[PDB]
């Protein structure tokens, strides 16, 4: 049950993972998660604000 994934690139490229333990808590670090939604903190406004339009009309 080997997982083959892309490595993080270096100076110049897959790697293999097998889980040895019956508990997911035993696993190595979670895979890179590039998810983001800054707007929930930077723009949590009820009515859409279009950058080019006046903020207050």
């Amino acid at each position: 049950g080997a997982q083959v994934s892309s490595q993080k690139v270096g100076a110049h490229v897959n790697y293999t993972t097998i889980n040895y333990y019956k508990d997911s808590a035993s696993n190595a670090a979670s895979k890179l998660d590039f998810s983001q939604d800054p707007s929930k903190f930077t723009e949590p406004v009820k009515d859409i604000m279009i950058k080019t339009a006046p903020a207050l009309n």
Partner: protein, 138 residues
């Protein structure tokens, strides 16, 4: 700042910085303000006529309360260091009256603005490190 505190867990930063200014005078106060970013290697600007030769915006005070000046990413290196460092110096942000603040009678003649900083979507950091902003006695 929140950005400063996050940067002090990293060694390297890259990208554009956003400076947003909120004018908090009375509605009756008018004015034009020059906000400038001068990339490094020349005399630091102490006069409007030097500041206006750099990246700048003329902010007209009015119904829209806030103005954003960008320090666009302009660097020799691909990353700057999160320390005081001549090689990765970032340059100079300054601010001058473009006209002046004008008020009518019965209005405060002194007032404030608030300056905010945030990272742009082109911004990233690397090389995790301990911060110099927390410690304990041993």
């Amino acid at each position: 700042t929140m950005l400063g505190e996050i940067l002090n867990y990293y060694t390297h930063w890259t990208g554009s910085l956003r400076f947003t200014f909120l004018f908090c005078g009375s509605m009756m106060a008018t004015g034009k303000i020059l906000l400038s970013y001068s990339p490094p290697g020349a005399k630091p600007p102490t006069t409007r006529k030097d500041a206006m030769l750099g990246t700048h915006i003329i902010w007209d005070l009015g119904l829209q309360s806030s103005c954003t000046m960008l320090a666009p990413w302009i660097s020799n290196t691909v990353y700057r260091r999160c320390i005081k460092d001549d090689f990765t110096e970032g340059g100079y942000i300054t601010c001058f009256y473009q006209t002046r603040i004008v008020v009518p009678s019965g209005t405060p003649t002194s007032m404030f603005m608030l300056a905010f900083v945030s990272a742009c979507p082109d911004f990233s950091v690397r090389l995790l490190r301990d911060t110099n902003h927390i410690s304990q006695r041993t």
